[PDB]
Amino acid sequence: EVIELPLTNPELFQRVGIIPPKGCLLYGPPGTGKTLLARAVASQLDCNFLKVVSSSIVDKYIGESARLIREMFNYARDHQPCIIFMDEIDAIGGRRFSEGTSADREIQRTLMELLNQMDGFDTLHRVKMIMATNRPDTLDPALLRPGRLDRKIHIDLPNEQARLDILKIHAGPITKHGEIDYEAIVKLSDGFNGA
Amino acid sequence: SRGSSAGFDRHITIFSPEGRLYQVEYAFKAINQGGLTSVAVRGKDCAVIVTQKKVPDKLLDSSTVTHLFKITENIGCVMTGMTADSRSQVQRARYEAANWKYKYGYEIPVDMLCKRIADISQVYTQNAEMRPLGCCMILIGIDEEQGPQVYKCDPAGYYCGFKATAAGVKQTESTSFLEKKVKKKFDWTFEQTVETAITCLSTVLSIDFKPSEIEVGVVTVENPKFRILTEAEIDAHLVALAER
Amino acid sequence: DVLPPEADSSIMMLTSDQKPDVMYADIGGMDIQKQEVREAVELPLTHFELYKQIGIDPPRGVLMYGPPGCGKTMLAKAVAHHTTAAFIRVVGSEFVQKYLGEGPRMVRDVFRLAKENAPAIIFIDEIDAIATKRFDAQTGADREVQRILLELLNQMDGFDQNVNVKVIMATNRADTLDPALLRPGRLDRKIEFPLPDRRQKRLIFSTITSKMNLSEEVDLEDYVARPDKISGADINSICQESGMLAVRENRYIVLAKDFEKAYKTVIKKDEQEHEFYK
Amino acid sequence: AAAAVVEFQRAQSLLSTDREASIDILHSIVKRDIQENDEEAVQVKEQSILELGSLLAKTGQAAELGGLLKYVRPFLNSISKAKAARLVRSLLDLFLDMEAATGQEVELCLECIEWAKSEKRTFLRQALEARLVSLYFDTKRYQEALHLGSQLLRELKKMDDKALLVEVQLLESKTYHALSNLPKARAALTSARTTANAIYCPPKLQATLDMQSGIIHAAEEKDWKTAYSYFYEAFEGYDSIDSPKAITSLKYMLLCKIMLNTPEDVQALVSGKLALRYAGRQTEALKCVAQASKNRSLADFEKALTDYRAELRDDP
Amino acid sequence: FEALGIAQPKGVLLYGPPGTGKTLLARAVAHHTDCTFIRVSGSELVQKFIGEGARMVR
Amino acid sequence: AERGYSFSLTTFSPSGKLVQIEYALAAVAGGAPSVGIKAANGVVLATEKKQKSILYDERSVHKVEPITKHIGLVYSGMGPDYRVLVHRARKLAQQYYLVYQEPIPTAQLVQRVASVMQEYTQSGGVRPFGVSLLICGWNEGRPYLFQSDPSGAYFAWKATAMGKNYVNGKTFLEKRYNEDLELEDAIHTAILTLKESFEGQMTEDNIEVGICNEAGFRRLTPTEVKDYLAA
Amino acid sequence: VIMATNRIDILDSALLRPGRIDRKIEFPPPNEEARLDILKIHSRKMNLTRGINLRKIAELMPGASGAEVKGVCTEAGMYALRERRVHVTQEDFEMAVAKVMQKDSEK
């Protein structure tokens, strides 16, 4: 709703008086089904999803991470609508300091480069952004904030239901004599993630 | 400040430079380690307790897994947190009630039981040799004049009366739900209370329970003896929820 | 020959059609600050005769900081909207390039262009990317920045007192900023952007809910009473959040829950602390 | 006791009027279960509140005036001290909020003014003063306030009460201005500006503190520009607030435009939502006088001196 | 002070409220003293200019 | 099996400070604010009893507690510790009454309580209490208002404030309050100085007030607090 | 080396061995006179009209420094600048007092 609709069914969004969503960030225990969501989204939606593992963006050439980000939003800015999907932001995710190595300064800027684009003056249009992380405890205050990230999307460890629900999905392609102990497996299976 | 530490203020129960007690906070964290959630709702003429009954294995006598305890024939409690600590605190509560009746010649009020237990845990908070208990007790019972009562005590020494409360993993969410559903002002009958509590837990966990996945304690004005509902009557309450 | 006023800065005057748009309207409940910038640039920039005669000494650069969402980037959009001079939007994250001199070459440009345009607003969103004090000459990356600072520094005070060019720098972490920046001359007026309170919120709420329609019975008052301390920005996640809930079920205009959800959807910071500590 | 009230309230809340209901209201006070009437009197007050505005719906607040002494003794034998402050503040207030004889107000006010002392909670004694000084200004007698306020200057400062000091400075300043003294009155307004800055503001009060300055900026003719900036804001206040005084400032806000010779900004002032919410004799006037000017005609202005003087005659 | 037989001084201290006029007394004298008046704080900018980093404050 | 740590946890720093005491005071200056005014014919204590929700029953725990029939208490800081001190103060009061068959003087109860607080800065194995107490009393015609801090030191006040923003509250009291005040006016200025911080619509269940005149100490009913909160 | 900080109680001991900070001089807060003087110096910068009693201003002042006063003056001008008036009467200053003592009372 936040992401797909505000594109093919935003023409009436203004009829409520609300700009399309801004950004969405998964954030959950390692294995809650985050990385599998970006895949499912770009597979179904299909439009212009550009995935950035937020790691291979870093180089070493002064502002080599500023140009990558500029081109990312530029390409997209022109090419929009486009989905921006960043895998693990904890990299550029950062948090700032006071301070750290002369290296950290590079990331920050770079960490800021995006922040200034997501908001700043020129107003993102059509092009939307999915933020990815495991552990959101690390992120900069100035990033989580609306105008940058709209609403955070939590993905908790599947319930006994969610387990069972997911359990019959991965074990569905297995040769199993009329003895499938789904209610037993799921039961003992607690705190167990999706993988 | 804002997270500052000095000396042993994160190991024993002494003051941090910003005036915190870190071991107590850690005890609160220890409550959630059980991975359970309990809901307590006070009615016009009753009090209801409800709790997940996680019996992960059929190799366990499912009758011996209970977080509901009889403190007195007319005072019930539900424990949330570290199991063995919970039982310790239950024994202490039992003793304090019995002793109260023996010295004062009337039945202990939940208010004073909770206050007593709390008072005991504050000592753990203030003495260095021992560590707080990683548990949380919620007491219910009918007082002679104040009507139905639900109280709750913490690992630090805090205790309070409630219209409705919860403890454990989904505490904040259950409080949000309940504080939404209390403002609506409805005739809090018995079934209204039971349904409210059960649905609070159910929606908070998104489960829709079997009658063997939860346990429901109760106390009424018409029947003040703390009664633990059989699986049958629980189910009777369950099927009535898939009607409206 | 002497190339007339040119070069990157990097764009050049924004143009006109690229207006920040955000009209003074949207930006509400910010008199002091609002007035402050107005008092810092808008007015001082225009009426110069009372700055010299009335013995006022106008300021050269203005610093904007505070929490992240209290509304500084809006303040620049508003100024570039009503404005009249030449609003240069140069990001401090662009100055450092893959070249050994590009940075100064720009500053000499933006500053060069500023002189040429007219009473122009140079605006630097997030000067952190340039000025972060704790420099380190050796990494061969710091060297480039420091100078960029020195560049900013040199052309920062090099003007003439007459050069009608104001400097507007926005940053939340108003801390990792070499004091060399905040010195009477380079960055005089220092302005703060609080995370609203009660009244302000009312203006922020009323202004946010004034863009849509909504149930006229309801009263975003209940919410304003609360503390939470929601920033001017977050209050926006709610207004938008309500639409998602009101639109997800199809229905022009919102409901109680639409805000309730928003309040529970935005605030988030439910717990926080403990009840014994007080 | 309770038998009547709620049922009577349920009867009252229905329709008819307080006056019929007064037979119950008066009876509420007159009755019934002789609780004390403790809570009843509070609810009898609930009438005497309504019943007061119902008293006003007829003019017995003069009745209740004398009874106000009795009600005192009546809460005195049932209503605690505090209970009086609230009960004794719902009569002197709701009574002043209505247009009637100055005396009965002054008479009663003065009464209860002196009552606070005989009881002795200087806190209310000062609060009631604001009304006593304000009423002495509108009523007629000016020299009266002069002494009252000049005695009240240290009555709020001792505690540093801040908004009451401004009120007396604002409110009292007006008395001086009318007494034909813009120097002193002016000086009084200036003093308030400095005092008002020390503390919060807050809203309405701040509007008087503005408009009033707009007034002084037009009392001696000192650029209708500096005054206009007070009228505009001071209009904004009453606008997004009680909206009772806002209707007043719109007038002066337009005055500056009429003098400045800009009927364009007057067109700007007449736009529906902003004020037009008032459409009446306040806008029609200044509009007709404005474009009447643009025509640079005198015949026209003369006729707008004629037909719309119903307000113009009532001004200072 | 040499003529009196007393080791002249080198170091001074100024202590009080913050913002009453201490730097001035250090600047004004220094100004009125025709002596280079230096302001050594801890800015990395300053070290890169004056001192090529070196390793201390000598 | 168990004994007790026998060594002091509160020890002198090289500067000569008892660091744990100042950190305990830091815990006090983080609790809900409380104001106390001695007013010629009586004493007023008030405090912010602000909950976290609508679920907590505010008619169940109180912060303004009676010690005897003529002495009352409020606190700033940690709750449980306050509870302990209140029990102990009631006990001390009753010891005194057994022995002298005369209700304990407010100064003496303050002394005794303070001694208890000082013990936990010198006995072994413990932290100091994280509580400041305001103790009001009526004895010998005059009214009495004392404060005791975690060090075990006590001071007599005409008026004072503790907890969050206690400095601004204190200044406000220094200005907007003076002698010859009747208890009613004192209640007024107390709720007034509490409002200088209460972030909320100060209701009749958001604050707790107690009085102490020469008719005994008592807690003001929610009704009475509503009446007083109606200005 | 002039090393001029605040609260001598902050500086270490090794920096106090009686001989090592030749002349230890201390700054006093600024009273009516000093302020008055300071007040006259800063107000001299801007265009100040007649009928301006500065003393009255420092009297209202209570706990300011060498910088604070500067803020007051500036605002006085700042206030007059907004009033569209080149000069700066006494009233203005009397406001700035608060406006600064607003800040003086603020953070």
Ligand SMILES: Nc1ncnc2c1ncn2[C@@H]1O[C@H](COP(=O)(O)OP(=O)(O)O)[C@@H](O)[C@H]1O
């Ligand atoms: N809800 C789920 N349904 C099916 N498979 C899942 C689910 N969650 C996790 N998995 C398994 O784990 C993988 C997804 O891991 P992922 O969510 O990317 O972890 P992380 O969040 O640490 O990146 C999938 O390839 C799948 O095999």
Ligand SMILES: Nc1ncnc2c1ncn2[C@@H]1O[C@H](COP(=O)(O)OP(=O)(O)O)[C@@H](O)[C@H]1O
């Ligand atoms: N009083 C207000 N009026 C209008 N918008 C506001 C107000 N307060 C907050 N906002 C909203 O919050 C956002 C503020 O963004 P901004 O302050 O630029 O963040 P940053 O400091 O990270 O650039 C804007 O989108 C603005 O609409």
Ligand SMILES: Nc1ncnc2c1ncn2[C@@H]1O[C@H](COP(=O)(O)OP(=O)(O)O)[C@@H](O)[C@H]1O
């Ligand atoms: N005695 C004084 N007379 C006039 N101005 C002063 C005085 N003391 C300080 N100031 C003002 O303070 C500013 C410099 O403050 P300074 O004293 O250097 O800071 P600090 O208080 O940290 O020493 C100057 O602009 C000056 O106007």
